[PDB]
Amino acid sequence: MRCIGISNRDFVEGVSGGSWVDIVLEHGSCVTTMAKNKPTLDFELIKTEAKQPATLRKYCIEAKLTNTTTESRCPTQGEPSLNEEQDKRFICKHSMVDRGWGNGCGLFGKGGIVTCAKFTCKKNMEGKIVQPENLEYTIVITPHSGEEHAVGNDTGKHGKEIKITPQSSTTEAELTGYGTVTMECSPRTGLDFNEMVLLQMEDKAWLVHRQWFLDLPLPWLPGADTQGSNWIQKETLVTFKNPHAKKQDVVVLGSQEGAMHTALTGATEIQMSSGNLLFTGHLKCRLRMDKLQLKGMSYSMCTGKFKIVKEIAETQHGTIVIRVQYEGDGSPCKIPFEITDLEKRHVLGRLITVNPIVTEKDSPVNIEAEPPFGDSYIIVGVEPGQLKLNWLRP
């Protein structure tokens, strides 16, 4: 009943009854499966997760230069040297500066200068290698148990959660009161992770060509040195300036964040809702209703009158949802339901929520059914006090 209220909702039914059925699941898609003498089920892919990522490299897109140290020597006094030179968190460069009487040297000539600055990364991106077989899929199987709160209930645990990998596709899922459904899936990702790197940038991700990722002119750390200090190629974002042989100055090159996004236009993007990855690709699955059974069926019809406890609402697909409460006696009971013409001659329109039953009298039942076009009569219960409700469907 979880699918009710979703636009991209697919109504799938089996051929030759419905023993087996093929369904395609995607992020945003929702599938309602129907099979004869089998309970109607709602399937929805809710999560996709790369489970054993290997960081290849980590790139610095935003760099900060702090703890600047400078040392200079007079002409004929040797090359200056700082202990920050041996320190790998620092970036150093030597140069020559004009020295004289006026700046503190007994003799005129070129004097050695050395500037060092601590390279601290502000923002970075990561390049993770994902094994295709290690993509975990979370699917919710919510049956059409008329249940008072079932209808579009996202959080309240009405459905069974099951995890699939391209590796392990076949799964048996137990639905309490219905039995077991078997799922043989097959992922249709659209783009494989073969010689692809998953380039993650804070809240955005891309699928990029390996050699392209390994060729970016940015400071980097290896997969072997995560939480490391020694950034390779600091020079790609740090530049030294000495154009008048007076003073050496260190300069950064500014955030490459935006610059990157531009290069990543001709790259497959991957989105993120609530911090998790939403893969564009599909997922074809084969179902088996063989060990599935309708809850009850061995029950007797409802002797008493029914009460419409909530106004009939039409879904975006033309189907209608009706919340009815039992005021009679017999529960656990079986709801008599029929959609007919204006003279009760022919039984028109199908029932989506197959085999509607009452468990507790106090608990209302949500019945979903596809009414026919034009004028129809929704009939809930048996004589006397049969709920007759006229329906409009252009």
């Epitope: 140290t69 400078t70 040392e71 200079s72 007079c74 007076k246 003073k247």
Partner: antibody, heavy 130, light 106 residues
């Protein structure tokens, strides 16, 4: 030739305080400026130094990491940033001008080892209690 | 940098204040600095570059340099010289250190 000082007062341990030292009567941009501590009833302790632009800076091992020096030649002022101030850092902070280096380096930029210095002009100081 | 605790001397008498602190480099002692500070008041540069004396500072104030020691001489004590004297030098090429402090008692 003045060296005015401001920023002192009540400070709780492990807290932030910025000390400003104003200047007039000399080419401030061209002089190395210094920070020197002195307990209520004890001896002088050299804290920090800055060259003309602030490229060469030095700090006492006692303050290294928790302290930071800075200056802007526009306002003709020198600053001392003190973060995570421990109780043992209680004293009267002084800002001094290294006037002797100017007789040698008319630029006050070049960070040489053991260059001739001499803290010429001193400020009245400012007391901090932590 | 170790300076004697206190040096006492009669008016007219000539005294000397020592300054020695571990450092094994001629770069240090040849660059010793001396400061005259009265209680509560701000310090004053009396000697720079071990022997050099700035204008204003009295002739009586002298500056000596030893191999691993520094000395401040007050040739002819006067009542006005009763103050605190602090020596100063290079810890490292880019670092300064003050001495223990000598209390001059006339």
């Amino acid at each position: 030739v003045q060296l005015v000082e401001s920023g002192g007062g009540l400070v709780q341990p492990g807290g932030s305080l910025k000390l400003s030292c104003a200047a007039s009567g000399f080419t401030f941009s061209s002089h190395w400026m210094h920070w020197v501590r002195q307990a209520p009833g004890k001896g002088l302790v050299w804290v920090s130094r800055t060259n003309s632009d602030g490229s060469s800076t030095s700090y006492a091992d006692s303050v290294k990491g928790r302290f930071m020096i800075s200056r802007d030649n526009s306002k003709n002022t020198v600053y001392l940033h003190m973060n995570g101030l421990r109780a043992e850092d209680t004293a009267v902070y002084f800002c001094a001008r290294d006037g002797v280096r100017y007789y040698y380096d008319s630029t006050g930029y070049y960070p040489d080892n053991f260059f001739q210095y001499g803290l010429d002009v001193w400020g009245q100081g400012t007391t901090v209690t932590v | 940098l170790t300076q004697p605790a206190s040096v006492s001397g009669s008016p007219g008498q000539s005294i000397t204040i020592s300054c020695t602190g571990i450092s094994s480099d001629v770069e240090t002692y040849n660059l010793v600095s001396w400061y005259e500070q009265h209680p509560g008041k701000a310090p004053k540069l009396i000697i720079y570059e071990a022997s050099k004396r700035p204008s204003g500072v009295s002739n009586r104030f002298s500056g000596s340099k030893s191999g691993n020691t520094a000395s401040l001489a007050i040739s002819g004590l006067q009542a006005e010289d009763e103050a605190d004297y602090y020596c100063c030098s290079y810890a490292g090429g880019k670092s300064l250190v003050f001495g223990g402090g000598t209390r001059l008692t006339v």
